[PDB]
Amino acid sequence: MWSHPQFEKGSMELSYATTMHYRDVVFYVTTDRNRAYFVCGGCVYSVGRPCPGEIAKFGLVVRGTGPDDRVVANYVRSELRQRGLDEVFLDSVCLLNPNVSSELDVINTNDVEVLDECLAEYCTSLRTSPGVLISGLRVRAQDRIIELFEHPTIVNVSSHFVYTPSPYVFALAQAHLPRLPSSLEALVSGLFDGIPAP
């Protein structure tokens, strides 16, 4: 037997009570129905009941190759500028993929495919082609918890080799947002109308 590599690092856990289906999105609604979580591009968005409701997102961000730098985040940012699109979460990383035109395309998607070999290299500290699948999110349906791992599983899309995440590159994070990404806003309109009040 082997010890599970993911438990050598931390996780974030978002607990919920019920699951509801709305506008093709699976929402995970808290016990007192103040929040609805949903999965998008390997990270979790949170929408609060309007009283607009609070918006936040949870998941892995990419930062630097060392504690005090942000070369990886900065790379993704400049890459996003060039496509025409502050912390860099995995769903922003999804947008680098030529098969993804907005956050809408990766709703309910737990895994993040990176075909950018430079970014793959940042993530793995090795020459990596043609790219990797990054998996840092699991829905624990029976426990009613969404779990986000600090140590993501990183697998070559073609050779299936598993890579050790480069130290310092990944961290768990939470961001408060003033609004959802524009392509996701319509998904939550009217959501709480079918969810009984706290």
Side-chain angles (χ1 to χ4, degrees):
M1 67 185 84
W2 303 265
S3 88
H4 199 305
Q6 295 190 318
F7 290 90
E8 287 302 285
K9 308 281 193 78
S11 63
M12 254 171 180
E13 298 209 339
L14 303 167
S15 73
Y16 63 91
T18 59
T19 296
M20 77 166 303
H21 291 167
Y22 187 76
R23 301 185 173 192
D24 310 312
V25 178
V26 184
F27 291 98
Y28 302 92
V29 184
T30 58
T31 306
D32 209 29
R33 305 180 228 79
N34 293 125
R35 266 187 186 177
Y37 298 103
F38 68 98
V39 171
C40 180
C43 76
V44 176
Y45 282 86
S46 166
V47 182
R49 180 180 306 263
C51 205
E54 304 170 14
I55 306 297
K57 69 192 293 193
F58 297 80
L60 277 171
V61 297
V62 287
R63 296 195 174 146
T65 57
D68 286 333
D69 74 89
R70 291 293 182 280
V71 68
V72 182
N74 286 349
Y75 175 80
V76 173
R77 282 200 198 90
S78 43
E79 276 301 304
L80 284 173
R81 269 182 271 268
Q82 300 188 351
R83 319 304 173 90
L85 305 146
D86 61 356
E87 287 247 70
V88 181
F89 289 80
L90 280 193
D91 75 315
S92 290
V93 176
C94 284
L95 298 176
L96 292 184
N97 190 312
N99 306 278
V100 182
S101 60
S102 78
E103 292 84 348
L104 182 58
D105 292 328
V106 296
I107 51 162
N108 312 314
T109 304
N110 300 322
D111 307 312
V112 181
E113 183 181 57
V114 172
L115 293 193
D116 185 308
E117 295 178 10
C118 187
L119 179 55
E121 180 153 355
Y122 275 138
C123 297
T124 74
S125 304
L126 300 166
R127 292 190 185 84
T128 301
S129 73
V132 292
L133 186 63
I134 304 182
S135 310
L137 187 163
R138 177 169 61 183
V139 171
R140 292 159 63 192
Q142 289 307 282
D143 304 332
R144 295 180 309 288
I145 289 159
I146 307 163
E147 182 154 47
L148 294 163
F149 301 99
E150 181 190 353
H151 183 285
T153 301
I154 302 177
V155 176
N156 187 292
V157 296
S158 165
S159 64
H160 304 109
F161 284 92
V162 183
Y163 300 108
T164 298
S166 298
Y168 304 116
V169 169
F170 297 93
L172 294 161
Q174 169 183 4
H176 297 295
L177 307 174
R179 63 189 292 280
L180 288 170
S182 56
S183 70
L184 303 180
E185 294 207 329
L187 296 176
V188 305
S189 288
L191 176 64
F192 286 92
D193 295 324
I195 309 182

